[PDB]
Amino acid sequence: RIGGPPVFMQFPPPPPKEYLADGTPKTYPLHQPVFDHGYTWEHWYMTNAGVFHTVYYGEFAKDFPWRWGFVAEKPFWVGAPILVLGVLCLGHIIQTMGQIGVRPKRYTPEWVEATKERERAENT
């Protein structure tokens, strides 16, 4: 349809490049940090690249913060079991901080015996 929204248009050329006064190319913000730590592992994974192709995807330690570089360096079945127990222990610790020294009377031996008497009478 003459004068309608074009099906295809070519991109205009990009705006002029900016140099610094000394000739250094002007750099712009980039959120791709080079984290500082001693880990240098490189993990590669065969990945689906459609139906008939694959791609060898690599993860580099320097692309990740220290915490992940440390964890991802160890064997999974060395870390995983320790982490599982640790998280569970921490949860219990957190839930015990608010009840330190709490001693309800219904959990004393005297109350425990009285319930046994009630159960005997009621054949519970």
């Binding site: 004068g3 074009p6 295809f8 248009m9 070519q10 065969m46 008939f52």
Partner: protein, 60 residues
């Protein structure tokens, strides 16, 4: 900033193909993407082999 792109003849700029006449035939050479090392960084060597295989279909 009203600026209609289409011209009087109802045309817009279009970039043509890379045409190369040869052997009594007009050919078009397709644009190949740059090496993945340039765009991703890793050097494209020692690539594991994943052969062509047609779709895994259930038979019978």
């Amino acid at each position: 900033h009203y600026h209609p792109p289409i011209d009087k003849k109802g045309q817009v700029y279009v970039k043509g193909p890379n045409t190369v006449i040869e052997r009594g035939q007009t050919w078009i050479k397709g644009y190949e993407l740059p090496s993945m090392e340039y765009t991703y960084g890793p050097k494209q060597e020692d690539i594991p082999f994943y052969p062509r295989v047609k779709l895994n279909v259930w038979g019978n």
